[PDB]
Design a protein around this ligand. Structure first.
Ligand SMILES: Nc1ncnc2c1ncn2[C@@H]1O[C@H](COP(=O)(O)OP(=O)(O)OP(=O)(O)O)[C@@H](O)[C@H]1O
Lengths: 58, 835
RNA sequence: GUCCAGCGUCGCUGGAC
């Protein structure tokens, strides 16, 4: 279960800390990259809802 | 034997000898170059976009590497610098292997003589690059052209770069010790300027017998490129004046004449090779194809387990789209084969790779996700939805309507048949068939909802198509979507409420209350009614059946509130009750969710006991009906062809009743003894019977669980005036399922659940609408007794027959007030013809 | 043979005894 706190000790805006919920999706992408090396290799991340999505790459 | 791996990256570079799919055609060419020089000598492989040209060229070159000819490394004209001449590149490639064989010589004497001789030629050619890249002549080089040389004593004066390069190839053959050297060019399929320099160089320079050139591409680009270049020669000023039809067609032929002559002169006809597509390699299932290909669907899968590509795509199409094993599913796989081979695996590889990790199932969404990415560029051409997180149920209803509008066909469009002439519409047709089957996934009566909005919203618009001039098409097709509210809706009956105004905007030519699945019940007391007919009063309706009667009402505000009895409201309501079951509270809400509050306005395109528990007796039955609904309907697999076919039977069936009961409205029909008598409770009885009829024939024909149909081998007709057509289909179904020891709930699930619907029970047998029919009373008794087995309740109690078959009594599951109701325009001049 | 039923703009077709 993804335990999420709201009243953080520092109380950041929106309480976004790291791998908020995309953790399952990130692990799927990372594993594919590792398995890829073991010849095009370009992936893609589609623009969703107009989100900035720059925070995903970082 | 050509095995292929769907777990490898499938890149052109990694293609080995085992996985190569063009073994036969490559051999035909490998043993064709050698036979040429042994006794313009330019070859041309040809294939469509995404046919595997690059992975085929590399096979020929590799094979020739292992009487003797040396092959240069392949050149791709697109990746080269924009301003680098082709001749410069070839010389550098040739110099690499020439200046690598010299270091292989062992004799010191036979090193410096040839190397210096070769070195002179390069310096000789390096001074000739002035002519290739220049914009104007210069007299400073005139004296250089008029020069005598001791090298070969050039017969032709001047520079003449053609002859300078010619002897360079002759020298290179001596050093490399080979009869001829092949120059191989790659495709220009992404550019239209790399091709022109390739075409011009071949025409002028590569003419000697020591060179063989193997181009690559497709004639459509090359043909389009040359014709554009030929128009450039015409003087620009000439093309504004003299623009007459006779003059324009005169030069139009001449350019096309120079188009074919130049192209044929460059690439000879007797050397072009067309690369076979996926179809010719495999061939038809019954026909013979001169290859055999098997695929992989598992890592380390044994080659014996490998299966033919037809089954590798047939199983995906059959299971993914939920179609029967038949000709309908054969059209999809056949069309899907006639696609670029690049796209074929990316659909095929993606679908199976997800399936492996799915198990670690909703198979249609696996194909839906896989096919959406592949056929994504064709989607934009028809303007479909692009958001992935909004693959909603109602989103599809908008997509089908706009697709059939673009397809320019309303009679067949809802079938989603890939028969569109345009190739773009063929691609999106299969995708829509995947969307429809994905959303159902054994949907809890959403199929019933999706049947109405998905297909009914299309064919109802045919009414305006009949009598309807280009500006008006987008004028109506847009706001009709807005008024009827497809793509945005709250309930199925909400759509059916707006349908009544659409139906009643233009009536039948005889101005009668019968319409396409519509019956009008008068509310204003007409004066001096002949016979026993009375005004339709809302109160006399009995209990436990008023709720069914309550749903069948649809008031339309069109300058006069008129109630319309509609099967659409009946079937539209069934979506509401069967939506979700958590409590027995909203089950009774839908019975009056559309009454006393839902008002419908004229369409813009007009242009002209305590009684608080009487309902609860039926509620427990409807609650128990949802128990069977929420136990079997999960296990069904609705298709994308039933919805296109159930409506087609239903639409024609209703249209037959509309023009069959017009002139047959007359007195002495208040009891409905015999046929040829049209009462309101019988006209509505046909429409509800038509809905129960189209579902039976289509479910038996097309489904997933029903692998083989269960119906007689005879004519298929629709009951329009009688009931015998329906019962005989039940009879032939009866023994056939029992003969195979197959129950109705599993072999025919879609019909089973809706038959035992408490809403539709009190409309199958109207008390005065049922024909007495002493001859045909055998039919209805046999018609009803068969239903006593499909539904195990048998709630008839055998006493409610007597009142309705003998021509007071207490009725619960039968309406006893529609017979006396009247219909607008029902003149009563004539009476029953003698029989 | 007569009847029921069905499709077409009366003509045509289906079923039973
Ligand atoms: N023999 C083959 N076996 C497996 N896959 C193949 C084969 N030939 C072609 N393909 C598929 O075609 C894709 C593209 O191959 P290739 O680049 O040769 O085709 P093309 O698009 O017609 O060529 P080009 O790159 O010159 O435009 C490969 O990634 C692979 O999926």
């Amino acid at each position: 279960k993804i335990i999420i706190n709201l009243f953080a000790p520092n109380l950041p805006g929106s309480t976004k800390e790291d791998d908020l919920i995309q953790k399952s999706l990130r692990d799927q992408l990372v594993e594919s990259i590792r398995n890829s090396i073991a010849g095009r290799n370009v992936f893609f991340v589609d623009g969703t809802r107009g989100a900035g999505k720059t925070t995903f790459i970082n | 034997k050509i095995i292929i791996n769907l777990f490898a990256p499938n890149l052109p570079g990694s293609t080995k000898e085992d996985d190569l799919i063009q073994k036969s055609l490559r051999d035909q060419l490998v043993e064709s170059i050698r036979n040429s020089i042994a006794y313009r000598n330019v070859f041309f492989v040809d294939g469509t976009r995404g046919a595997g040209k690059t992975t085929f060229i590399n096979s020929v070159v590799k094979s020739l590497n292992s009487v003797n000819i040396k092959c240069l490394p392949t050149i791709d004209p697109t990746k080269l610098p924009r301003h680098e001449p082709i001749l410069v590149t070839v010389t550098a490639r040739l110099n690499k292997m020439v200046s690598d064989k010299l270091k292989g010589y062992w004799a010191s004497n036979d090193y410096r003589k040839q190397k210096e001789q070769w070195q002179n030629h390069l310096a000789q050619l390096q001074r000739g690059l002035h002519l290739l890249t220049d914009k104007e002549y210069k007299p400073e080089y005139f004296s250089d052209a008029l020069k005598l040389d001791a090298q070969l004593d050039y017969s032709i004066g001047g520079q003449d770069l053609s002859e300078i390069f010619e002897e360079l190839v002759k020298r290179a053959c001596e050093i490399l010790d080979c009869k001829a050297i092949l120059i191989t060019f790659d495709d220009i399929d992404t550019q239209f300027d790399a091709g022109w320099d390739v075409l011009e160089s071949i025409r002028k320079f590569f003419n000697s017998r020591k060179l063989v050139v193997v181009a690559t591409g497709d004639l459509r680009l090359y043909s389009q490129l040359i014709r554009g270049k030929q128009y450039e020669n015409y003087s620009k000023t000439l093309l504004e004046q003299e623009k007459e039809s006779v003059r324009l067609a005169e030069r139009g032929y001449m350019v096309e004449h120079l188009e074919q002559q130049y192209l044929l002169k460059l690439f000879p006809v007797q050397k072009r090779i067309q690369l076979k597509t996926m179809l010719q390699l495999v061939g038809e299932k019954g026909k013979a194809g001169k290859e055999e290909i098997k695929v992989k669907t598992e890592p380390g899968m044994q080659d014996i387990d490998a299966i033919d590509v037809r089954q590798a795509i047939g199983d995906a199409v059959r299971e993914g789209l939920n179609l029967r094993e038949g000709s309908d599913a054969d059209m999809y796989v056949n069309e899907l084969l006639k696609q670029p081979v690049r796209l074929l695996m990316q659909v095929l590889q993606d679908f199976y790779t997800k399936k492996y990790h799915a198990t670690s199932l909703s198979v249609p969404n696996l194909l839906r996700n896989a096919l959406y990415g592949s056929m994504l560029s064709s989607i934009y051409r028809a303007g479909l939805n692009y958001e992935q997180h909004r693959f909603g149920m109602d989103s599809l209803c908008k997509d089908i309507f706009t697709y059939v509008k673009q397809d320019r066909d309303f009679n067949t469009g809802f079938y989603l048949r890939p028969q569109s002439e345009s190739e773009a519409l063929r691609n999106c047709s299969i995708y829509l068939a995947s969307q429809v089957s994905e959303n159902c996934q054994g949907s809890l009566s959403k199929f019933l909802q999706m049947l109405l909005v998905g297909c009914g919203s299309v064919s109802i618009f045919n009414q305006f198509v009949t009598e309807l001039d280009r500006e008006k098409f987008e004028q109506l097709i847009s706001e009709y979507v807005a008024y009827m509210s497809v793509g945005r809706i709250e309930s199925a009956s909400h759509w059916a409420n707006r349908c009544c105004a659409v139906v009643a905007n233009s009536p039948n030519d005889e101005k009668i209350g019968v319409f396409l699945g519509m019956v009008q019940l008068n509310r204003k007391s007409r004066q001096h009614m002949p016979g026993g007919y009375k005004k339709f009063n809302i109160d006399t309706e009995n209990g436990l059946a008023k709720a069914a009667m309550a749903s069948s009402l649809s008031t339309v505000a069109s300058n006069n509130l008129m109630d319309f009895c509609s099967v659409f409201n009946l079937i539209g309501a069934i979506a509401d009750i069967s939506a979700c079951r958590c409590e027995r509270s909203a089950i009774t809400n839908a019975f009056n969710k559309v009454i006393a509050q839902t008002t419908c306005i004229v369409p813009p395109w007009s242009e002209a006991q305590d009684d608080a528990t009487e309902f609860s007796d039926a509620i427990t039955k409807v609650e128990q009906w949802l128990k069977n609904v929420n136990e079997i309907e999960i296990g069904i697999r609705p298709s994308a062809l039933l919805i296109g076919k159930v409506w087609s039977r239903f639409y024609f069936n209703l249209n037959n009743v509309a023009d069959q009961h017009k002139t047959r409205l007359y007195r002495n029909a208040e009891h409905g003894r015999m046929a040829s008598q049209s009462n309101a409770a019988k006209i509505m009885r046909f429409n509800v019977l038509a809905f129960l009829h189209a579902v039976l024939v289509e479910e038996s024909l097309y489904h997933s669980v029903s692998d083989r149909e269960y119906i007689g081998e005879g004519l298929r007709l629709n009951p329009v005036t009688s009931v015998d057509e329906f019962e005989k289909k039940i009879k032939i179904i009866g023994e056939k399922l029992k003969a195979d020891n197959k129950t109705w709930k599993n072999t025919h699930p879609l019909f089973f659940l809706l038959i035992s619907c408490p809403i539709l029970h009190p409309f199958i047998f109207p008390v005065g609408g049922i024909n007495c029919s002493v001859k045909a009373l055998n039919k209805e008794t046999s018609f009803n007794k068969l239903i006593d087995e499909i539904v195990g309740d048998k709630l008839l109690s055998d006493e409610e027959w007597d009142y309705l078959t003998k021509n007071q009594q207490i009725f619960q599951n039968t309406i006893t007030s529609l017979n006396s109701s009247t219909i607008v325009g029902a003149s009563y001049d004539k009476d029953t013809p003698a029989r």
